[PDB]
Design a protein around this ligand. Structure first.
Ligand SMILES: O=P([O-])(O)O[C@H]1O[C@H](COP(=O)(O)O)[C@@H](O)[C@H](O)[C@H]1O
Ligand SMILES: [Zn+2]
Length: 454
């Protein structure tokens, strides 16, 4: 089924669209692709899902039947798998994960020879299977215990000044295997919330991008008078943040704090953010002498862009934050949490006042309009072709973004759902609704039937 080969990764329903047999052939396809790039060595990890044991053995056998040398790192967060692919012999790795999709989902995040696959590169794996353009060989499997290396890597490079008390919510995802322990080892007291790994995800699904999944966290932070709240998503490559007073700090505001710190030590450094992030981030980066690079949404696309630009830091609005400075340049919520605590601990102000000090504007959440999968990209192309946007700085690298003096707006197509994704920001509520109006008029110009929920 080509439907499981997605823009950023592979994702399927275990049994239905993703079976044991398909996991094997995906392994052969990846192993074959790795060998074609001259990399026999592949690390393999999995998240906390129930299907993980079943499917990962098939992934591994697929790799091994190509002649690949597999390093099995067991059940780890996604960033720990990316880490393994940076410190072991090979620069390839596959993470078996369904991230924060419902329990029955699983999938693959794939790096081959240092490069995170996306778009045509993921299609190329399906194509190898169909064509039987597959390597055959007698590979090897080695058990590798990678967590302690990861844990010590971070701990030894992080220096907190003051002690902090932190609520850590892992939503019963695999971040529980290390984030509470690592964070404590930095010099914090950790209040654990849903830190037990449970593939059933009994409490709230680990999706920090939705405020409903941060309610328990916010509540505990306040109840325990904690210095900060942290939530990790299913596989640990997203982080969500809450202040001592329960304010949700969206990832583009988090990136402002990170950009200030990275740019400070690294004059001129390129800093990447996706099209969903506040314009205030463009200003800030530039004001500290950095180079802002706006790019496409999607972690694979962002990681590729970091290689093309030499960026020292990237972030997406969904909460993937990619440090190259002092790190390896992959997205990692657990490392980003540590880098955050390091910065906050130097400050005599509480976390609410650190973040409230930066400019904040009136801002919508991410807005979604469900359209048909047939129509979503065409709608955008129509907006790019047909629509007169004047006027503002118009960016078309991913959807249509328009930047004005006192605000901005975005419409893009999701690469994971049949939806249009919108965000609007302005200095004032008045300006915000004026930008909303323009976008609503332009969508209804393409198709008067289109839902416009804003
Ligand atoms: O969970 P992941 O690792 O696949 O991460 C991906 O999930 C979402 C799907 O993107 P889209 O807006 O195109 O649907 C994005 O918001 C996020 O930025 C991206 O990295
Ligand atoms: Zn994730």
């Amino acid at each position: 089924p080509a439907s499981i080969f997605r823009a950023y990764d592979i994702r399927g329903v275990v049994g239905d669209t993703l079976t044991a047999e398909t996991a094997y052939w995906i392994g052969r396809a990846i192993g074959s692709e790795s060998l074609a790039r001259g990399e026999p060595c592949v690390a393999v990890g999995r998240d906390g899902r129930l299907s993980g044991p079943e499917l990962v053995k098939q992934l591994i056998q697929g790799l091994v039947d190509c002649g690949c040398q597999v390093s099995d790192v067991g059940m780890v967060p996604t960033p720990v798998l990316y880490y393994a692919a940076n410190v072991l012999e090979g620069k390839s790795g596959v993470m078996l994960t369904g991230d924060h999709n419902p329990p029955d989902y699983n999938g693959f995040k794939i790096v081959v020879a240092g490069e995170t696959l996306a778009n045509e590169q993921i299609q190329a794996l399906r194509e190898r299977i169909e064509k039987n353009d597959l390597a055959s060989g007698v590979g090897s499997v080695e058990q590798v215990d990678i967590l302690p290396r990861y844990f010590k890597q971070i701990r030894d490079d992080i220096a907190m000044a003051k002690p902090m008390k932190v609520v850590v919510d892992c939503g019963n995802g695999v971040a529980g295997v290390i984030a509470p322990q690592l964070i404590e080892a930095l010099g914090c007291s950790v209040i654990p919330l849903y830190c037990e790994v449970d593939g059933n995800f009994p409490n709230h699904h680990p999706d920090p991008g939705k405020p409903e999944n941060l309610k328990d966290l916010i509540a505990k932070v306040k109840a325990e008078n904690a210095d900060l709240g942290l939530a990790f998503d299913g596989d640990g490559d997203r982080v969500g943040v809450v202040t001592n007073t329960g304010t949700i700090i969206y990832p583009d505001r988090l990136l402002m704090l990170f950009a200030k710190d990275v740019v400070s030590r690294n004059p001129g450094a390129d800093i990447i953010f996706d099209v969903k992030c506040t314009r205030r981030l463009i200003a800030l980066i530039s004001g500290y002498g950095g180079r802002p690079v706006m790019w496409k949404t999607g972690h694979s696309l962002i990681k590729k862009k970091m290689k093309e630009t030499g960026a020292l830091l990237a972030g997406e609005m969904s909460g993937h934050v990619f440090f190259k400075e002092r790190w390896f340049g992959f997205d990692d919520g657990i490392y980003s949490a540590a880098r955050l605590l390091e910065i906050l601990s130097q400050d005599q102000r509480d976390s609410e006042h650190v973040f409230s000090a930066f400019p904040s504007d009136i801002s919508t959440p991410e807005i979604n309009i469900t359209v048909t999968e047939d129509s979503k990209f065409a709608i955008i192309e129509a907006l790019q072709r047909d629509a007169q946007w004047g006027e503002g700085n118009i960016t078309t690298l991913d959807g249509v973004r328009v930047d004005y003096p006192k605000g901005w707006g975005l419409v893009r197509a999701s690469n994971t759902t049949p939806v249009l994704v919108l965000r609007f920001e302005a200095d004032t509520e008045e300006e915000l609704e004026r930008i909303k109006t323009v976008f609503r008029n332009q969508l209804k110009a393409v198709d008067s039937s289109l839902p416009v929920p804003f």
